[PDB]
Every structure is written in C-alpha cells, then in structure tokens.
C-alpha cells in the first residue's frame, strides 16, 4: 500500500460574505478528492488573540490557508476608527500568517482591498502600484494594515521561500453579506435601504453625490477565482480579482440596479452631506486576464437581482 | 508653579539614549530604561513598566536593528504606543530612520515623501516597521486626538556608540579601525569605494533637538532632524576626519569588494529650519575629534 496526504484548507472568517461564497462553490463541485475544507469564525477562535490563533492552527493542522478574516466595514465605519482598524487587522494578519507558517502551511492566500492603492495615482491601477504612494486619508488605518500583508508575504518568501500570496478584490457584494444600514458596504447597505423604503412607503436616501465610480465583484465569482488562486497562482505578488475597467459603474448606476431589482417606484434622493470617499479606484485585471482570459463574470444587474432575491427570501436569518 | 512630568525614555542604554541623559544633566522626572528593565517585544512586560512608571511623556528610542526585523519592531512599537496611550500619556515622540524613505526618489527627501514609494530591498522589513510608527501616530490622533509624533534623524555618531568593527556604523567602525591601526602600526581599510554621500548628526545635537521636539513640536507628521543638504560629506571625507582627529599618518586603502550601499539618502531640514532657524549644529570635524577623544578616554 502507498498513500498520499490530503490537503487541509483552513478558511479564516468562513462565516462571512466571501467565506459563505467559497462554502457554496466548494460544495457545488469545486472541492477535489481528499481535500478537507475547514471554515471557522470568531466563535471558533478570536484571531486578535495569539494564544487562541496558535491553538486553532495546532488543532486543525492546515496544509493550505485562505485568510479572509478581518475588521471589515463600509466607508462610514472604517473612517471613524482608523486606530482600531489598523491595530486589530495587523494583530490578526500577524497571528494567522505566523501560526500557518509554524504549523508548516505550504500556501497562504490572504484577502486585500482596492483601498490599499494610492490616493494620487494614474488609472488603471495595477498590482505594481500598491506601494507607489499613500492611500486615502479616510480609511488609511485599514488600508495600511492590508498593505503590510503583502510586506509580510514578501518577507516570509525571502527568509523561508514561503508561497504566501494575496488577492485584491474590488467591491464585493452577494448573499450572506452585512446588510447593516451603518456598518455595511455600498451595495448591501442600499439593498436594505430600498427594502425598508418599499415596506414603509418612504423615499430612498443615497449617501454622497452618487457619482463615485466603482468596480463590483459578485461573491460567487470571487469564490471561484479564490479557489483557483489557491490551486494554481504561485506568485508572491498579489493578483487583482476584478471585472474589466470598462465594466465600471457609478453609485447612481448601482442604486438604479437595486431599485430595478426590488421593483421600487418611489423617490430617490442623494444626501450630499455624507462623504463620497474616493471618486475612482479603477483597477486593472490585465494580470488576471493573462492567467484566465476566458473566465466569464456574472452580469452586475443579474447578480444584483439575485442578491436582492436572497435578501427577501432570507431576511430573518440575514445580517 | 510648573506642572509635573514623567518622561519615560525607552532604550535609554543606547547612543541616542545616553546623549539625552548627558544633555538633561525642573519638576520633570526623567526615566531611562533598558532591555534589562523590560523586554519591549513582550506585551505583559511593557504594560507593567508603563503601569509602574506612569509617564506623562514618552521618548520611544528602543528598536531591533527581514521577517524578524519586521515582526519584533512592529510588536515593540505597538506595545510602547498602546501602553503609553492607555496610561494616559500626553505626548509620545518616537525615533524613525532615513531608511524609511523610498529607494527610487527625488532629492532632497522631505517629510511628505516618507510613503511615496517602496524602501530599499535590503532592510525593507525594518524600514516598513518604522514607517508604520507614523501610520499609528496619525491613527491615534484621528481616533483620539493624541499628540503622538516621530522624528527622522540622519547618520548619528558620538559617545556611547557601538564601535564594533563589524556591527557598527561608518564613523564608529572607522574610529575603532584607526585606533587599532595607530596601535598595531597597520594600514586603514575603508569599506566600499569611499564616494557614497551621508549626512551626519552629532548625538548631543540630536539630544538637544529631541528635548525641544518633546516640549514644543506638536505636529503628528514627523520632523527630519538633520544638518543641511549642503553639509553632506562623502565616506572618504568622513574617513579623513577620523584620520586627522586620531593623528594617524599610515596608509589608507578602500576595499572595493565590500558593498557601498545606498549612494545618497539626502534629507531636507526645511521643516526644522522653519521652527529653529538659528539652531547651530556641532561642526562635523570638531564632533568627530570629540567622539575620537571620548573613545580614547573611555575604551574599556
Ligand atoms: N466586502 C467587500 O466589499 C470587500 C471588498 C474588498 C475586500 N474585502 C475583504 O473581505 C474579507 C472579509 O470578508 P467579507 O467582506 O465578507 O466580511 P464579513 O462578512 O464581515 O466577514 C468577515 C469574517 O471575519 C471574521 N472575523 C472578524 N473579526 C474576527 C476575529 N477577531 N477573530 C476571528 N474571526 C474574525 C468574521 O467572523 P464572525 O462573524 O464570527 O466574527 C467573518 O467570518 C476581508 O479580508 C476584507 O478585506 C471585502
Ligand atoms: N545610530 C544611527 O546612526 C541612527 C541612524 C538613523 C536612525 N537611528 C534610529 O535611532 C534609534 C536609536 O538608535 P541608537 O543609536 O540609540 O541605537 P542603540 O545604541 O543600538 O540602542 C538601542 C536601544 O534599544 C534598546 N532595546 C533594543 N531592543 C530592546 C528590547 N527588545 N526591549 C527593550 N529595549 C530594547 C536597547 O537596550 P539594551 O542595550 O538594554 O539592549 C538600547 O538602549 C533607532 O530606532 C534607529 O532607527 C539611528
Ligand atoms: N456604505 C455605504 N455607502 C454608501 C451608501 N449610500 C451611498 N454610498 C456611497 O458608497 C461609497 C461607500 O461604499 P463602500 O463599499 O463602503 O466603499 P468604498 O469603495 O470604500 O467607497 C461612497 O462613495 C458613498 O457615498 C450606504 O448606504 N452605505
Ligand atoms: N559600518 C561600516 N561602514 C563602513 C565602514 N567603512 C566604510 N563604510 C561605508 O560607510 C557607508 C555608510 O555606513 P554606515 O554608517 O554603516 O551606514 P548607512 O547610512 O546605514 O549606509 C557605507 O557605504 C559603508 O560601505 C566600516 O568599517 N563600517
């Protein structure tokens, strides 16, 4: 008898929007034979605590790690607490990457954000420009915390030859998202706002001007890409997992898709008192398209309708 | 009639540490700690030192000088800045470096360019660890209105330096190398070509500036504590000052096999000169002679 060792994939923050997305895709036929997929949350172990993190990694001895856990929040949450967003995430990313390493994990794929890119820059922004200037002053604590993941990934590789990498998704949306009207992101935040407005018979209030351009990525698409990165992408440099620069949409265009999907025919107003954040974050998927040129993304408006459908179908259980 | 102060100096057993000790020597208690006092990488040991010595002001000089350099310094700077904050410290002045500046850049490098590109690949772990002090300083201020700042000195030299002929800097290494060469009757061997340019700052001058920053500089953005861009000296010029100070008339050779490192790090003291325009620095050659004098007077 001759027997080959199985792969143990530990997904940190597996209860989240991206976490639950990867769960669905792996079950829907992405998991290969032998592979054991372990999806954990805060209840499992508080990743800010070093002792709790080292215990989870010594118990579940992973060969592969997908680092999705983080102190996440939308523009109106992360701009209020830049010290907490910095400290907690640096603590978390340190604990996860080091515990993975000392438990002998072969690969670690962490999740970055398009807010890591510099404020004053040229467009489209590629993977080389991640450190070419400071990020936007609003959420710099969270931005620099995610930037330092790449610094760690390059540091582990130069000192130990570690295949620790990262991915840069755009604005993620989809089922099992945080639909809080204050803590959530733009798309989940509006999906709740239209739901309440359609129920109460009230008008829709979109925060900011409504002009900032954003690239949106469906959670189930990102999950498909995330699984591929873990199984084939062996570069230390991160990869931008995003839809084309030509497939960019405005906040007003996104708000219109949410109004269309939920069949809302009330008033739509823009609260210009609220911050608009960054006007453009336009990312280049040129590196992604050299690897997967025939990968087809879910159409924005169809994906929005499905996210709106899931939220109506599952509301009592939703966030 | 003067308000009480408790200035905690982390890493007071170093070159800059001992410099601040000398310059300080009204109603302000100066506490100089070492690695023996507390291990600043350990959170429990750091929180204990800050709860015992309850400081109103903190001068963060301690540091470890690629994964280890990054992790240890981030751990240290986190433990010190957080413990200071939760012990209600009014001001924290940390010590950055010129290695934080980007590799591919324009010269002179000002305080705005600290994040305008990646640092040199050689010591990036350390460079990024010191960069994130500024990120923390700005983060504590936006969330709590904390007056946590940092300073960027150039190449520091002076008494109580590390004069190791392998671990030390250019001037301490050249000071020990000339001492041994003058004693043994041997020739002097200077690493690299001898042409790389550096800005040198006397430890006692930096100490004088450090004390002023703590008492008057209330900006979150760091300040470059350096001599003028026109007062930049080459390593051959620096090696000549050491030779002239120790009265060495032997052979001086340059080991080209050894690395010359970064040719220029040219910093701009434009911000410092807007604050202290009449601050006079110790002349390089006089400061070199005094460092050489101290080393001969105190060798054991
Ligand atoms: N959503 C977007 O638009 C977007 C865009 C770009 C990048 N990202 C990246 O997406 C990742 C997070 O996924 P998400 O956006 O779907 O967020 P999410 O729904 O809020 O879920 C985040 C996950 O992190 C876990 N977590 C948070 N704090 C933790 C702690 N102290 N200890 C252990 N686990 C902890 C959560 O567990 P519990 O529920 O148990 O606390 C949860 O499973 C992050 O790496 C973020 O940078 C998101
Ligand atoms: N020297 C230069 O040319 C130069 C140039 C640019 C910037 N700087 C900056 O200046 C700062 C101070 O440098 P320096 O000249 O004073 O160097 P130094 O002589 O090597 O002093 C380092 C100090 O840090 C303390 N320390 C180190 N690790 C510690 C730990 N784990 N726990 C507690 N204390 C610890 C040491 O105490 P122990 O002795 O007890 O171990 C010592 O007092 C550094 O952060 C450096 O980046 C210096
Ligand atoms: N989070 C959130 N953003 C909104 C909302 N309404 C409009 N926006 C706009 O959406 C953007 C913030 O969304 P988010 O996913 O947090 O982030 P960004 O890409 O970091 O700006 C800003 O341009 C806001 O003006 C809302 O209800 N919630
Ligand atoms: N440390 C050290 N540097 C030397 C010596 N001789 C020449 N150098 C050169 O001095 C330059 C600056 O050295 P140093 O003070 O260590 O530091 P830097 O500013 O960190 O590069 C480099 O180009 C070295 O090659 C020596 O004996 N020790």
Which tags fit this structure?
homodimer, 319 residues, alpha/beta, Rossmann fold, UDP-galactose 4-epimerase, domain 1, 2 domains, six-stranded parallel β-sheet, two-stranded parallel ribbon, 10 helices, 12 strands, globular, binds NADP nicotinamide-adenine-dinucleotide phosphate, binds guanosine-5'-diphosphate, oxidoreductase (chain A), EC 1.1.1.271 (chain A), isomerase (chain A), multifunctional enzyme (chain A), identical protein binding (chain A)
Protein model, in words:
Chain A has 319 residues and is α/β, with parallel strands linked by helices. Chain A has two domains: 1-173 and 215-244 and 282-298, NAD(P)-binding Rossmann-like Domain (Rossmann fold); 174-214 and 245-281 and 299-315, UDP-galactose 4-epimerase, domain 1 (Alpha-Beta Complex), CATH 3.90.25.10. Chain A contains ten helices and twelve strands. The first copy, chain A, has helices at 17-30, 50-59, 75-78, 82-102, 140-160, 186-200, 219-231, 251-261, 286-291, 300-313, and strands at 8-12, 36-39, 64-67, 107-111, 163-169, 171-173, 204-207, 213-214, 216-218, 239-241, 249-250, 268-271. In chain A, the strands form four sheets. The first copy, chain A, has a six-stranded parallel β-sheet, sandwiched between helices. A two-stranded parallel sheet of chain A has the order 6-9. A two-stranded parallel sheet of chain A has the order 7-12. In chain A, helix 1 (17-30) links the parallel strand 1 (8-12) and strand 2. Chain A is globular and about 70 Å long. The N and C termini of chain A lie far apart (50 Å). Chains A and B meet through helix 4 and helix 5 of A and helix 3 and helix 4 of B. Bound molecules: NADP nicotinamide-adenine-dinucleotide phosphate (NAP) (2 copies) and guanosine-5'-diphosphate (2 copies). The site of one guanosine-5'-diphosphate (GDP) has 17 residues of chain B, from helix 5 and strand 7. The site of one guanosine-5'-diphosphate has 21 residues of chain A, from helix 3, helix 6 and strand 7. The PDB classes it as oxidoreductase. Keywords: oxidoreductase. The assembly is dimeric. The entry is titled "Crystal structure of human GDP-L-fucose synthase with bound NADP and GDP, tetragonal crystal form". Chains A, B are GDP-L-fucose synthase.
């Amino acid at each position: 008898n001759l027997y080959f060792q199985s792969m143990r994939i530990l997904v940190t923050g597996g209860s989240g929007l991206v976490g639950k997305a990867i769960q669905k895709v792996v079950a829907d036929g992405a998991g290969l034979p032998g592979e054991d997929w372990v999806f954990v949350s805060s209840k499992d172990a508080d990743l800010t605590d070093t002792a709790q993190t080292r215990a989870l990694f010594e118990k579940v001895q992973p060969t592969h790690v997908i680092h999705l856990a983080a102190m996440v929040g939308g523009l109106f949450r992360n701009i209020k607490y830049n010290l907490d967003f910095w400290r907690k995430n640096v603590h978390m990313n340190d604990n996860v990457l080091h515990s993975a390493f000392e438990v002998g994990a072969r690969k670690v794929v962490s999740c970055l954000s398009t807010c890591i890119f510099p404020d004053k820059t040229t467009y489209p922004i590629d993977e080389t420009m991640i450190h070419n200037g400071p990020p936007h002053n609003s959420n710099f604590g969270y931005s620099y915390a995610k930037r330092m993941i790449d610094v760690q990934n390059r540091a582990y590789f130069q000192q130990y030859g570690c295949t620790f990498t990262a991915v840069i998704p755009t604005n993620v949306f989809g089922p099992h998202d945080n639909f809080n009207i204050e803590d959530g992101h733009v798309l989940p935040g509006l999906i709740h706002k239209v739901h309440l407005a359609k129920s109460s018979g009230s008008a829709l209030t979109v925060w900011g001007t409504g002009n900032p351009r954003r690239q949106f990525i469906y959670s189930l698409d990102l999950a498909q890409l995330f699984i591929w990165v873990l199984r084939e992408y062996n570069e230390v440099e991160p990869i931008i997992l995003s839809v084309g620069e030509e497939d960019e949409v405005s906040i007003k265009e996104a708000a219109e898709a949410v109004v269309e999907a939920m069949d809302f025919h009330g008033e739509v107003t823009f609260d210009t008192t609220k911050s608009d954040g960054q006007f453009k974050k336009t990312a280049s998927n040129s590196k992604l398209r050299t690897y997967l040129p025939d990968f087809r993304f879910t159409p924005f408006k169809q994906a929005v309708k499905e996210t709106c459908a899931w939220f109506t179908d599952n509301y009592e259980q939703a966030r």
